[PDB]
Amino acid sequence: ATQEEIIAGLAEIIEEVTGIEPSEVTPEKSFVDDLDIDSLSMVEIAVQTEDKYGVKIPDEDLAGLRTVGDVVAYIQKL
């Protein structure tokens, strides 16, 4: 489904940016709490999505997204 595809894309970006395998990446966990992801890493994820695919997450909005669920929902909305 679309959800699986978007989650797989995000997990591939996760593997590229900070080298954690997509296998254990699930939408039932946060970024900083578990994966030790800095605000800059999330910014890199946003830029990668914007470039490779057609999506835009404006500034002063990534902070409001804490869990993978929030990010995937926001992407699906647009």
Partner: peptide
């Protein structure tokens, strides 16, 4: 490789 990819994110979003 990670400390040069994270500093790179501070060049394209701002």
């Amino acid at each position: 490789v990670r400390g040069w990819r994270k500093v790179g994110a501070a060049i394209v979003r701002w």
